[PDB]
Amino acid sequence: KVFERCELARTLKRLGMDGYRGISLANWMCLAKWESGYNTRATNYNAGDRATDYGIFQINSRYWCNDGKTPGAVNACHLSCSALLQDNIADAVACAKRVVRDPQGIRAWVAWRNRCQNRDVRQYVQGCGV
């Protein structure tokens, strides 16, 4: 499913993402935007290392979910990567919360550093009523 901006904002808010581990809703919106464009079925295989990024948050199959074909994969979220491809993002959000519970936090995603860090990310939640 490809979420409309405000629809996603309200959904994430309801799932307890706003201010989770100090991460504001607008940063999460900036992350999903640049990682997948609010698309839940987005997948990206990295031929150089054999791991694939799944879903709206492009969560990695090496550390977070298990797809069975990634070498030395730890399944920290204890989920099948398939779960991060559903239209219902409840599992993707619970896994994303797991990821940021690590010391790096939201910095775990390079795209966040490139396009969200130190920027005016207000635009991502404007007019959504969250």
Residue extents of the structural domains in the chain: 1-130
CB 12 within 8 A of CB 20: no
Class of CATH domain 1-130:
mainly alpha
Residue 60 β-bridge partners: 53
- Name the strands in the sheet holding 51-54, side by side, starting at the edge strand that comes first in the sequence: 43-46, 51-54, 59-60
Please give the distance of CA 116 from its chain centroid, rounded to a whole number.
Answer: 13
- What is each CA distance from 78 to 9, 24, 116, in whole angstroms? 26, 25, 28
Method: X-ray
Residue 7 appears among annotated catalytic residues: no
* Residue among 107, 127, 129, 108 nearest 118 (CA): 107
Structure tokens at 51: 């791991």
The resolution in Å comes to: 2.2
Beta partners for 45? 52
Residue 72: how many CA atoms within 13 Å on its side-chain side?
A: 2
99: Cα within 13 Å, side-chain hemisphere: 23
Annotated active-site residue in 35, 49, 87, 91: 35
- Assigned token pair, 113: 């550093």
Nearest-angstrom CA–CA distance, 71 and 93: 24
Neighbours of 112 (CB within 10 A): 20
DSSP tally for the chain: helices H, then strands E: 4, 5
Tell me whether residue 35 is one of the annotated catalytic residues.
yes
Q: Which of 53, 91, 102, 120 is catalytic?
A: 53
Buried b (16+ CB within 10 A) or exposed e, 26-63: bbbbbbbbbbbebebebbeeeeeeebbbbbbbbbbbbb
